[PDB]
Amino acid sequence: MLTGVIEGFYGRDWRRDERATVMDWIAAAGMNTYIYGPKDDVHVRARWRVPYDAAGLARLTELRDAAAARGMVFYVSLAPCLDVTYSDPQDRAALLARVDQLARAGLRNLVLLFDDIPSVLPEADRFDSFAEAQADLSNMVLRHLRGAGHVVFCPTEYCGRMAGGDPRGSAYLQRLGSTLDPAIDIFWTGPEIVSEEIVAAHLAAVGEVLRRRPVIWDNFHANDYDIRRVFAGPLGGRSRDILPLVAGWITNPNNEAEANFPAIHTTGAYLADPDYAPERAIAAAVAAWQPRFRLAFGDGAVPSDLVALLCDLFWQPFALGPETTRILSALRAALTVPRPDPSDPAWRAALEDLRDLKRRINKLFTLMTEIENRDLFHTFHNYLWEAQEEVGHLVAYCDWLDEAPPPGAVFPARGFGVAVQDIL
Numbered sequence: 001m002l003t004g005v006i007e008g009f010y011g012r013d014w015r016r017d018e019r020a021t022v023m024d025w026i027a028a029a030g031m032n033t034y035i036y037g038p039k040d041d042v043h044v045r046a047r048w049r050v051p052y053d054a055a056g057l058a059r060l061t062e063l064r065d066a067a068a069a070r071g072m073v074f075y076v077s078l079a080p081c082l083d084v085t086y087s088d089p090q091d092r093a094a095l096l097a098r099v100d101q102l103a104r105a106g107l108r109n110l111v112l113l114f115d116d117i118p119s120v121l122p123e124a125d126r127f128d129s130f131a132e133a134q135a136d137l138s139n140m141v142l143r144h145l146r147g148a149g150h151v152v153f154c155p156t157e158y159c160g161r162m163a164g165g166d167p168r169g170s171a172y173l174q175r176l177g178s179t180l181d182p183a184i185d186i187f188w189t190g191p192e193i194v195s196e197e198i199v200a201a202h203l204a205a206v207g208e209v210l211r212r213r214p215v216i217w218d219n220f221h222a223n224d225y226d227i228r229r230v231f232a233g234p235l236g237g238r239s240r241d242i243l244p245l246v247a248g249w250i251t252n253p254n255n256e257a258e259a260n261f262p263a264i265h266t267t268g269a270y271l272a273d274p275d276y277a278p279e280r281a282i283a284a285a286v287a288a289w290q291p292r293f294r295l296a297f298g299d300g301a302v303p304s305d306l307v308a309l310l311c312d313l314f315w316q317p318f319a320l321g322p323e324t325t326r327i328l329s330a331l332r333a334a335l336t337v338p339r340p341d342p343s344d345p346a347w348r349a350a351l352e353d354l355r356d357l358k359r360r361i362n363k364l365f366t367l368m369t370e371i372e373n374r375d376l377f378h379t380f381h382n383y384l385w386e387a388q389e390e391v392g393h394l395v396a397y398c399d400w401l402d403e404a405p406p407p408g409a410v411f412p413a414r415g416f417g418v419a420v421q422d423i424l
């Protein structure tokens with residue numbers, strides 16, 4: 001089974017040290033695949049007919065080798081879907097020269113992406129469909145490798161919603177399933193681009209129409225679409241019972257390399273462990289992550305409980321972490337009335353936990369500014385700044401209610417920020 005990371009998100013490309021770091025993490029998580037396909041690389045997509053430079057190939061072979069050194073396989077992406085005439089011999093040879101330049105460089109693991117297409121088939125073509133054309137084009141690529149290499153296909157309709165709800169209801173998928181060579185794997189992101197859950201019944205349906213088990217392309221931890229947010233919590237919403245229904249697991253992670261330690265650590269635990277539990281898994285990721293938080297000029301590091309807090313604040317796309325969730329729910333239960341009673345123990349307890357949360361966020365903020373690893377600092381600073389401001393606002397508001405102000409009086413002047421603003 002193919003497992004690992006795709007560098008396939010909308011952001012900056014990683015440096016060579018960053019890719020090397022990510023590769024260590026993937027291998028340590030017991031995963032086996034790294035897929036190269038950054039938007040930085042003009043050859044991947046924007047100008048796909050243009051073969052790599054001598055130096056560009058060199059860079060890729062280097063990555064292949066850094067991955068092989070780690071017990072991982074390395075794939076190269078090609079996205080000839082925007083301006084493709086699927087029947088044109090000039091385009092076909094150009095695709096084939098791309099494939100051949102790589103194949104002969106000894107880079108035979110490929111992804112072919114068809115995610116962004118023209119609304120109608122190009123005149124010099126209208127096969128019966130986009131599906132048949134892409135399928136034919138992809139089979140060509142397969143037949144060119146002569147059974148020595150591997151191809152994964154990213155389809156145009158890659159989640160339930162884009163397939164109309166039930167994937168068995170899509171014609172593109174119907175046709176893709178029957179025309180695409182069975183040696184070629186197909187990506188799927190679940191019922192949505194960013195799926196809150198991916199359930200067994202859903203993937204049974206997908207398997208039927210594609211006539212094969214899909215390779216998961218999981219966007220659970222991606223943050224390109226919302227640069228206001230980052231996801232440092234554990235992989236959630238996918239039961240272990242869906243794994244017999246898949247051909248693979250590729251994570252599309254956060255834009256910033258340093259952000260991805262927990263996403264990779266917990267995904268790998270999900271893949272390896274029958275008893276995977278998100279809260280237990282994030283505890284192990286924190287314990288293994290903490291050494292990256294060494295303080296500058298010092299032997300000490302950010303303490304474990306604060307690293308744990310970081311994950312808790314910036315948890316999942318559809319959930320704040322359990323610790324901050326319960327602290328805010330207890331405060332909500334106490335704000336059931338407009339004027340909390342300062343003497344009430346329930347309000348007293350909620351408030352003190354809120355105030356403690358602020359102290360802890362403030363320590364974490366300050367400590368992060370002092371860490372040796374500046375990239376890790378840069379990765380989190382702004383998210384932490386917002387967290388620290390709106391817990392500040394929440395405490396000032398509740399500190400105000402704790403003075404028994406007369407009613408009528410007015411206060412003088414998914415994730416953490418929004419949860420807080422929802423309470424205001």
Ligand SMILES: CC(=O)N[C@H]1C(=O)O[C@H](CO)[C@@H](O)[C@@H]1O
Nearest residue numbers: 008009010158193219222224225
């Ligand atoms: C197959 C797929 O998911 N493609 C894009 C997408 O639509 O969603 C992700 C998260 O926004 C992006 O990083 C992907 O490049």
Ligand SMILES: [Cl-]
Nearest residue numbers: 047048049050
């Ligand atoms: Cl081009």
